[PDB]
From Swiss-Prot:
Subunit structure: Homodimer. Interacts with the oligomeric lectins MBL2, FCN2 and FCN3; triggers the lectin pathway of complement through activation of C3. Interacts with SERPING1. Interacts with COLEC11; probably triggers the lectin pathway of complement.
Record's protein name: Mannan-binding lectin serine protease 1
Highest taxon listed in the record's lineage: Eukaryota
Record's function text: Functions in the lectin pathway of complement, which performs a key role in innate immunity by recognizing pathogens through patterns of sugar moieties and neutralizing them. The lectin pathway is triggered upon binding of mannan-binding lectin (MBL) and ficolins to sugar moieties which leads to activation of the associated proteases MASP1 and MASP2. Functions as an endopeptidase and may activate MASP2 or C2 or directly activate C3 the key component of complement reaction. Isoform 2 may have an inhibitory effect on the activation of the lectin pathway of complement or may cleave IGFBP5.
Amino acid sequence: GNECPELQPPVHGKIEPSQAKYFFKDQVLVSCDTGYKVLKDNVEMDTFQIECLKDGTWSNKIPTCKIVDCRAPGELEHGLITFSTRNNLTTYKSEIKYSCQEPYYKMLNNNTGIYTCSAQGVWMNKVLGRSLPTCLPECGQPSRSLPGRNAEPGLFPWQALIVVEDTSRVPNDKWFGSGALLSASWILTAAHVLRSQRRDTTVIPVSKEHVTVYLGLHDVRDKSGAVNSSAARVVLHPDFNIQNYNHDIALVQLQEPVPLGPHVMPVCLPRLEPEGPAPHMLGLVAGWGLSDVLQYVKLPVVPHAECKTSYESRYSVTENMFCAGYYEKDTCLGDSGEAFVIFDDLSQRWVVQGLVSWGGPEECGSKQVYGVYTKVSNYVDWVWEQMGLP
């Protein structure tokens, strides 16, 4: 059998069987090491067979080994990709790191975010495998620090302005509200802001079409740097009573979710405890209610009993409510559901404790006329349940 010549194995692979000499009708398999596939005619293969023809020629020349390429790694949501090297290799053994966008989002499980391009051409994380990490919004950490004073940009990032334009009435019936960001797609407020006004006692949510919400707004005159979204849905608390304002709490779902920024972040919800914030504890309240800039004030929570009994000489302050205010200037920025936020101890984040529900018709500062607040800790389960959280 006339003999075929010797074979050099391709860079990064082997031939088999490898023998000293090869003769007529001999078969060999060229294959590649782990990170590689045999390349020939633009097809990739695991093995390629070569045969020794009568005339001492081989059927093909020995082909080449291509390194495995995992291509562009999948993009991460609210996250970004850093390549382990400025070359941004995407081929075998190459390494990438996923990080969430900070400080607006934080990564779950503190998973490493380390993906390496595997032999099978798939970006692999030791734990998550092929599956990406998860970026969740960070709440209650304002990008500005605390310096009825005016409000600076980025101070109350969760602060939302609700604008309702009821166009089903002639002329258009228009009013304003205050909202607190819970996540990129949800605003918390008082049910009473979203109640459609009428002569009977039946409770009707305003129409979703008539609602628009602004975020990152400080000067109503400067809508620049401002985010605006219409309403996917309007949800009043199902037990809200327009008569005594019981269960005065509601959400607006945002049709087009907002970009978290230095002037737009959500506030954190309170744990589900039953007690009203301890008396004398100090909270913040920010609103416009009128004014063009946003303003805020520090207010102390007021012993429940005392508030309740003051509102006994005309309605009722229930255990789903707490009061804030002093017993006697203008520290009443809110008619309309503005949040009562308190900086939490442990967590070190701002927590919405209250939604402004009502107050006496009396003059702002009037003797023992305390602002009454929906106790948000009593509705969080309900709030998460609406948001699908739950």
